[PDB]
C-alpha cells in the first residue's frame, strides 16, 4: 500500500496473509472455514495466517491454518486477469474472536464515489521497495466505470473495478494482491493489478466481487 497509514490494532480482523515460505498475497475471511483471494495468487501449498498485524513478529494472536481446498474461478484468464478470484477452504475452522472476524459479501455492487478501505503488507514505495512489518490501510473511492476504462483502454472487463485516485500517489502495490477492498462493510473488490503503483491516471484494478456472490455461495455449498 503506497500512501496509506499503519492500520490500528484491532482493525481489519478479516485480513489474512497467504504464506508459502514468505508472505506473497493477502485474502479475506468470509466465514470460519473459507478465504477469498485472487486466482493469480494460486500456489499448490499455502499456509493461511490469521490474526496478523506485525507479520515479522509472533504477537500471540495468530492462527496459522493450512489450505485444504484451493479453487480458482473456472474462467480465470492468466493473461488478461479476467475472473481473478479464488476460494480457499481451511483445513480446520478459524476461531472467530476479537482479533479474527469475517467480512460480508456484497448485497449490491458499489456505486462510483463510495469510499472503501484497502489493506495489505505490500510495497509502500512507487519507486523503490519498502515492505512493512505492520499492516497498511488506505481509504479510496470506487471510480466510475468510464474513468476506469479510459485509464486502461481495452483492458477493463465487466468483472473489474478501479478504486483509487487518478492523481496517483495512493494505491495498492506488489504484495497486496488478493487482499480486501471493503466498502460500507461489504467486500467489493480483491486487489488484482495495475500499471506500476500509484502512478497518475493508472489507478488499481480490482476484481468486482459483486459479480461472483452466487459462484462463491454455490462453491461453498458444494465443498
Amino acid at each position: 500500500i503506497v500512501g496509506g497509514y499503519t492500520c490500528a490494532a484491532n482493525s481489519i480482523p478479516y485480513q489474512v496473509s497467504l504464506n508459502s515460505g514468505s508472505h506473497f498475497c493477502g485474502g479475506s475471511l468470509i466465514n470460519s472455514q473459507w478465504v477469498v483471494s485472487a486466482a493469480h495468487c494460486y500456489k499448490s501449498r499455502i499456509q493461511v495466517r490469521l490474526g496478523e498485524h506485525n507479520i515479522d513478529v509472533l504477537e500471540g494472536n495468530e492462527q496459522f491454518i493450512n489450505a485444504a481446498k484451493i479453487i480458482t474461478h473456472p474462467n480465470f484468464n492468466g493473461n488478461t486477469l479476467d475472473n481473478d478470484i479464488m476460494l480457499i477452504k481451511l483445513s480446520s475452522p478459524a476461531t472467530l474472536n476479537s482479533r479474527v472476524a469475517t467480512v460480508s459479501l456484497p448485497r449490491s455492487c458499489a456505486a462510483a464515489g463510495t469510499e472503501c478501505l484497502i489493506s495489505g503488507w505490500g510495497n509502500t514505495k512507487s519507486s523503490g521497495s519498502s515492505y512493512p512489518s505492520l499492516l497498511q490501510c488506505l481509504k479510496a473511492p470506487v471510480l466510475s466505470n468510464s474513468s476506469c476504462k479510459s485509464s486502461y483502454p481495452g483492458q477493463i472487463t465487466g468483472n473489474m473495478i478501479c478504486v483509487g485516485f487518478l492523481q496517483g500517489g495512493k494505491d495498492s502495490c506488489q504484495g497486496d494482491s488478493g487482499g480486501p477492498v471493503v466498502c460500507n462493510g461489504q467486500l467489493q473488490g480483491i486487489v488484482s493489478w495495475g500499471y506500476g503503483c500509484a502512478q497518475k491516471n493508472k489507478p488499481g484494478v480490482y476484481t468486482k466481487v459483486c459479480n461472483y456472490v452466487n459462484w462463491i455461495q454455490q462453491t461453498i455449498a458444494a465443498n
Binding site: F24, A38, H40, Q174, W193, C197
Partner: peptide, 28 residues
Amino acid sequence: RICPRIWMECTRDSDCMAKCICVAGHCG
C-alpha cells in the same frame, strides 16, 4: 504494463507474470 500485484522474486524478466518485469530481484 499489466502487472499483477503479487510479491515475487525473480532473476530474469521471464520469471514474472504477465507484463511485469524483474526490477531488482522482484517483479513489478
